[PDB]
Design a protein around this nucleic acid. Structure first.
Lengths: 125, 94, 103, 125, 51, 229, 62, 206
RNA sequence: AACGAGGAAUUCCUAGUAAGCGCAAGUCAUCAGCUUGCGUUGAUUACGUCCCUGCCCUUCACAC
């Protein structure tokens, strides 16, 4: 079977499901290229993982992301978290663990929200 | 750590692979003659190489930079690196 | 009034300068230096404005006894500025110096 | 009203003003409140030190600028000649003197004042 | 500098009602307001009586 | 041989208001104005007309004189400097209500009519033109500091302060700035009404001055200083 | 000229006015010299303050 | 000496614009301004004007109100964007503020060739009041660096907002003028005048 | 005729908070002159101090 991994990203009610499989660098969001994600002002937000680790790593995989719920911003954050988590999971499962560590180090160095869900749970005081 | 493997070629190139997946990661090109020794310290930070041209290169494996270069009078035949004390001996041609 | 607009963006107006109460026939950017603007007016003074500072001219060249309708910047000589009036004289100025009197 | 430390600073200014005055007066030859209270300047400052509660004492001492610490040291030096006062309040002087030195030790050592070196030497022995 | 005069009603009273140019327009406003005040009072008394 | 301005037609100077904060100006704050209303119809409380009522209110009748505040408003607005559009008048009532006076206004001359306006102003919070084209008198929000020009020199009138030449003081002061004078329209008392705002206090003459004459004397010096003529 | 002073201790139980904190600051130019000053904003140790005048000593502000 | 980590040219089946790849090379604000050369001129403001972490867009969705001094770590541009949205009508609209700041940085680069982020940092350094008054009359006190940063951002934003409230100018252009003037140190900026007034009144009651 | 963001005084508020936007439901009391839910966008300023104003509490080692 084709090697594949699945991951989830969540921000408020926005949920993104990312499938990462062996491939030829085909990144899609809701059946469209990643370049067409909107709003354009926040597009680079979704690009943040792809640029942090370099496009070479993506050149060998296809990523398909399906997003539902929430608004524009929450969907953008869901997409980026899903892409990062899926990439790290794929490098864990079907590539060396050293690359996994390098990816985790880079992402947590830049923004830990890319991996850990940001849940603003209420705190009575 | 058992993650990387260094191969020294007779044409002066050092190729670094990953043992788990056998995928090439980095290639270092300083020596023009055959590389007769490679070693990496216990901390996986500073890397040292030697070649028949007589130069001993000092590398920073993390940053992939040339820390320094040392030229010896004669060609170098073999290398033994002691990780505990950070001393390495070189068997020179003379 | 002299206005500077983003080319290809008519809606936006970057900078608006009231160079003089008289008509301002010539408004040419300096080829060597981007930030400085020269405006020649029927007031017969060819003020040399700066984009960053629009309230007062960086320099004001004078000495033209009639309308100045011609302004040119000499290539390779950023300090030099040439203005020609209907007096029949072509006046050359040195902005590096104090100026306001043709060289 | 005046708080701990602020009271001590006021007392140091008064008592050491007279101690400087008499020494200059004696050197050349070779106030109302103290007269009203009928106490020698050593006692007046020493009396003020006693009234400060111990829980507020350390916090009171830190508030003083350095220029009063030099005043504080001379007060201790002046007390030394009065053996009766010293053995009466020996534990109190020792605790306060050490806390002052420990708190601003760095700034004390920097000074090159020869007179200060002699005072601590006398205060030491 | 241009000069103008202030507009004001001599012997102003804020509790008093703003003067209206039209008498019919003023009078109806008086009659409408009496209706709202009178209607609100009558409903209030009826509700209390019913309770 | 400087060329002339293109158009020499006389052009009315701009009307200067709170919104404009860059232009040079001379501001007069008639501090502690005595302007209050009360029912008998509502009437502006007066020192001589209403003695019986004010005794009941408990405030001392000596400090119940709007005529001083009217008087200062009269002289300031008819001064040439206001005619030159370089003057704007602010009034601080004793109670703490702050009134903006548009320079355009033409207050009625007789003191009786003036009292008619104040009650409307204090109650309607604004006064409108006869032609209804701008608001002449408008109440605004304390503190006075925010409405004043951003870069501005503040002074008060103190009899005890050193005497200065108003002309000399203005010229030595910078240009892009503006000047505020806090004058006490109150009849008599300590000169601390504006001490919270002001930085330093000055006197115009060794001799004592009424609120009206002091304002006239100061504004004229600016006219000579600024070449207002 | 303006001096720079690094806070080394935020004094407590000083009885200062609300929102004003008494601190002890050592000059960067001379680490030895120390001076006690009043600070208006949120202040913590190891931050640097710009002192216009280096002579005045702080006094309790009530 | 060379170290080579890529042996095959990277072509992705999904087309990616060339600008995005040059962004792969280095992180730049809006992919147009580099954080490498920006430095805070005043030493005191360092550790409270945060420019070390390059970001692509001002929107970060971070948590900076939890602890007392987290606002320091927040990038300065994002704080400027946040301070840009006020007066109720603009409350909740961060995307508009990001667009305004993008346009303003473009304008600043246009009028002056300097790096716009450098101009922003210079303005924030220059408009920070170094000595203030407290009501007792008044009496002079010093100001903490965080309060300087906060008041500098607030003064710049409020001045730019007021200048274009009832003027033909748009917020972006007046903000650009305010930042340029403040970085220059000129009096023409509202923030510089307010700062000078505060320091002068503090000096009077010193 | 009235009006161009609303004076003095006074009230509330510390993070998914203030504020803006709409969509649903009407659940035995209340509510439609409206009430309650739901999601979306989402900040500034404090997070110290008892100086002022109120309320409150006190007078089994070692070390003190």
């Amino acid at each position: 079977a084709v090697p594949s991994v699945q991951t989830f990203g969540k921000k408020k009610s926005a949920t993104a499901v990312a499938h990462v499989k062996a491939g030829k660098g085909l990144i899609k969001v809701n059946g469209s290229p990643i370049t067409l994600v909107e709003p354009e002002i926040l597009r680079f937000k979704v690009y943040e993982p792809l640029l942090l680790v370099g496009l070479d790593k993506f050149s060998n995989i296809d990523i398909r992301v399906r997003v539902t719920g929430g608004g524009h911003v929450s969907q953008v954050y869901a997409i980026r978290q899903a892409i990062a988590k899926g990439l790290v999971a794929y490098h864990q499962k079907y590539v060396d663990e050293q690359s996994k560590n390098e990816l985790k180090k880079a992402f947590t160095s830049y923004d830990r929200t890319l991996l850990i869900a940001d849940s603003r749970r209420p705190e009575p005081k | 750590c058992g993650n990387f493997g260094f191969i020294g070629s007779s044409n002066g190139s050092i190729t670094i692979y990953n043992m788990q997946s056998g995928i090439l990661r980095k290639k270092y090109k300083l020596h023009k003659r055959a590389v007769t020794g490679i070693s990496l310290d216990g901390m996986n930070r500073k890397m040292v190489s030697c070649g028949l041209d007589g130069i001993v290169g000092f590398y920073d494996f993390n940053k992939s930079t040339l820390l320094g270069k040392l030229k010896l009078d004669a060609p170098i035949t073999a290398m033994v690196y002691h990780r505990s004390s950070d001393l390495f001996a070189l068997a020179l041609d003379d | 009034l002299v206005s500077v607009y983003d080319s290809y963006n008519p809606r936006t107006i970057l900078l608006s300068i009231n160079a003089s109460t008289h008509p301002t026939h010539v408004t040419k950017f300096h080829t060597q230096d981007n930030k400085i603007l020269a405006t020649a007016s029927d007031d017969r003074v060819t003020r040399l404005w700066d984009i960053s500072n629009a309230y007062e001219p960086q320099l004001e060249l004078t000495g033209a006894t009639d309308y100045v309708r011609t302004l040119s910047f000499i290539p390779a000589a950023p300090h030099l500025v040439a203005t020609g009036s209907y007096d029949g004289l072509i006046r050359l100025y040195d902005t590096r110096s104090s100026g306001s009197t043709p060289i | 009203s005046l708080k701990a430390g602020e009271r001590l600073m006021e007392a140091l200014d008064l008592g050491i003003a007279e101690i400087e005055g008499l020494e200059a007066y004696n050197r050349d030859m070779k106030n109302a409140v103290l007269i009203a209270v009928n106490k020698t300047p050593e006692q007046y400052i020493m009396d003020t030190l006693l009234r400060i509660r111990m829980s507020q004492l350390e916090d009171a001492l830190m508030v003083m600028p350095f220029s009063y610490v030099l005043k504080f040291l001379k007060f201790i030096d002046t007390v030394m000649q009065n053996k009766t006062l010293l053995h009466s309040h020996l534990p109190l002087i020792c605790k306060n003197l050490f806390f002052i030195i420990k708190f601003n030790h760095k700034e004390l050592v920097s000074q090159k004042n020869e007179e200060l070196k002699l005072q601590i030497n006398r205060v030491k022995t | 500098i241009p000069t103008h005069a202030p507009k004001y009603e001599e012997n102003f009273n804020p509790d008093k009602k703003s003067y209206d140019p039209d008498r019919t327009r003023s009078e109806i406003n008086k009659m409408k307001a009496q209706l709202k005040k009178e209607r609100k009072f009558t409903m209030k008394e009826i509700r209390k009586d019913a309770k | 041989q400087k060329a002339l301005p293109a158009s020499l037609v006389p052009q009315a100077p701009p009307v200067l208001t709170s919104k404009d904060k860059i232009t040079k100006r001379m501001i007069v704050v008639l501090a502690m104005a005595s302007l209050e209303t009360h029912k008998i119809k509502y009437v502006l409380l007066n020192c001589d007309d209403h003695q019986g009522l004010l005794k009941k209110m408990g405030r001392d009748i000596s400090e119940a004189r709007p005529d001083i505040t009217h008087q200062c408003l009269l002289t300031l607005l008819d001064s040439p400097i206001n005619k030159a559009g370089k003057l704007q008048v602010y009034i601080q009532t004793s109670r703490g209500i702050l009134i903006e006076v548009n320079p355009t206004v033409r207050i009625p001359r007789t003191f009786k009519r003036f009292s008619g306006l104040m009650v409307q102003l204090l109650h309607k919070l604004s006064i409108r033109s006869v032609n209804s084209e701008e608001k002449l008198l408008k109440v605004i929000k304390n503190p006075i500091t925010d409405h004043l020009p951003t870069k501005c020199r503040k002074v008060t009138l103190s009899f005890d302060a050193p005497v200065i030449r108003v002309q000399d003081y203005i010229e030595k002061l910078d240009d892009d700035e503006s000047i505020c004078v806090f004058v006490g329209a109150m009849a008599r008392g300590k000169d601390n009404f504006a001490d919270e705002y002001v930085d330093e206090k000055v006197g115009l003459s060794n001799y004592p001055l009424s609120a009206s004459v002091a304002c006239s004397k100061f504004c004229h010096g600016a006219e000579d200083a600024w070449n207002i003529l | 000229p303006v001096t720079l002073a690094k806070v080394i201790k935020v004094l407590g139980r000083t009885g200062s006015r609300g929102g004003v904190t008494q601190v002890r600051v050592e000059f960067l130019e001379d680490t030895s010299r120390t001076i006690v000053r009043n600070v208006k904003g949120p202040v913590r140790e190891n931050d640097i303050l710009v002192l216009m005048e280096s002579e005045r000593e702080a006094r309790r502000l009530r | 000496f060379e170290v080579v980590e890529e042996f095959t040219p990277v072509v992705l089946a999904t087309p990616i614009p060339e600008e995005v790849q040059q962004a792969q090379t280095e992180i730049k604000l809006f992919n147009k301004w580099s954080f490498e050369e920006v430095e805070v001129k005043d030493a005191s403001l360092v550790d409270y004007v945060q420019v070390r972490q390059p970001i692509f867009v001002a929107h970060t969705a971070g948590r900076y109100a939890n602890k007392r001094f987290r606002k320091a770590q927040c990038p300065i541009i994002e704080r400027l964007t946040n301070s840009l949205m006020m007066n109720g009508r603009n409350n909740g609209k961060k995307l508009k503020a990001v667009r305004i700041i993008k346009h303003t940085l473009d304008i600043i680069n246009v009028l002056t060739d300097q790096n716009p982020i450098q101009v922003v940092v210079d303005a924030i350094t220059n408009t920070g009041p170094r000595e203030d008054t407290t009501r007792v009359r008044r009496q002079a006190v010093d100001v903490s660096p965080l309060r300087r940063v906060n008041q500098a951002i607030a003064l710049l934003t409020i001045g730019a907002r007021e200048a274009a409230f009832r003027n033909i100018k748009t917020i972006a252009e007046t903000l650009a003028e305010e930042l340029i003037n403040a970085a220059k140190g000129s009096s023409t900026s509202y923030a510089i005048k307010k700062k000078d007034e505060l320091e002068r009144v503090a000096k009077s009651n010193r």
